[model samples]
Target: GAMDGLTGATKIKLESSAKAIVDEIDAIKKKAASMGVNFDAFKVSENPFILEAKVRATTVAEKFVIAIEEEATKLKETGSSGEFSAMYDLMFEVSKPLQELGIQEMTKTVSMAAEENPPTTAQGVLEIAKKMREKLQRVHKKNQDTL
Candidate 1:
């Protein structure tokens, strides 16, 4: 039986390294489909050398996040109506949370990852995640009714 259920859908419920991003995306998605262009976000690697590498840097991650934050800020000057405005507002709101989280988790990630024992509060990780979740979920449920 141990080996039997170990084929498909048998992986333990370990949170992915990027699970918050997925839910954040999904919340925005369902906020939009109830949406997005799509994203390329699947790959693999391992071992201590690799572990050290991922732990050392998240520069690329930060830049892309900066990209979105700027995009939303720029989108603000442009105009829209009703659903469009709501969605736009959602972006602007999430931009801040993403900024708060981007650094918080990355620090936590690398610290716990490399166990540098850095100087940030891990207490805020899920707090921010949950705040982000609630914000997006509010939008999703609110518009879900409209849909």
Candidate 2:
């Protein structure tokens, strides 16, 4: 029982760190336009991060969602029901804030792209990420409610 609690706490810390890293990437994304790159390219709508930071962010958020759903199902079967509530709540809470921030940063990137590099594809990579983030947020919320 104690070990489970500890694990849940550690998971929250990791998710928090994940959110921070994603925020840093968002900052970098802001400058992508100045570097003559397209923000949309990072958005999963245009390009892949070559499987680097951008893709890492996507995969992490995706895994977070999958983990929550899988765990919830497992708990139901185990008859633990609300036993994993804290874990589920932490995952959803952290992901929601990060996803909202991602969308804002993405939108900023797109607007900047249009202003600085007109007549070209905006390469809204960040925007694509924003869309995925939004989807994850919904899934997180739904599962969180169940918990």
Candidate 3:
């Protein structure tokens, strides 16, 4: 969940990124194969807590993404997208934890928890990271081009 300190727009962007991860199962599966593991092992269907946690996270991600898209659209419609972009950058700078969390989740930055539980099946988590790396890098490169 997003921290209370995060601005609404920053939260929305984080949510959008997180929800986008759910669709990268193919990448996850392939990575898991390389690790000699399968995703089925991590499937804890009987654990209500696990199911609820995933559901809650997914729902939050979805709702936040919608809010972000809507806000971006509103900015564009009013010809204030540039201002909003600046605001977004400001918010991102202030929300260090939120930014770090995303980086930790979706890149070469591995967590202690992940190291401890190392993927026993298709590395779904890292697979999601792979996708994020591509998308984020594209945006980063674009930003650098204007610098």
**Model 2 alpha-carbon drift over 4 Å, by segment:** 1-56, 79-82, 104-134, 137-147
- The C-alpha lDDT values of all candidates are 0.31, 0.42, 0.36
The TM-score values for the models, in the order shown, are: 0.24, 0.36, 0.30
Residue pairs clashing, model 2: 39-125, 40-123, 40-124, 40-125, 41-123, 41-125, 42-125, 43-125, 43-126, 43-129
Per-residue lDDT over 5-61 for candidate 3, one digit per residue giving the tens place of the 0 to 100 score = 224565456444544444343344355467665324223234333233333333333
Task: Give the per-residue lDDT of model 1 (tens digit) for 66-146.
Answer: 333333343344322232223222323334433332223322332242223211222222233333334434433433344
Q: Is candidate 1 or candidate 3 better by TM-score?
A: 3
Backbone clashes in candidate 1 total: 2
Q: Model 2, range 43-146, lDDT digits (tens) per residue? A: 42323232233444444565654544444444443423133444433443444434443333533432343344321111222233244455555544543444
Error of 1 at 132 (Å): 0.6
Error of 1 at 138 (Å): 1.0
Model 2 quality (TM-score): 0.36
Model 1 C-alpha lDDT versus the unseen true structure: 0.31
Q: What's the CA RMSD for each of the models? A: 20.7, 15.4, 16.2
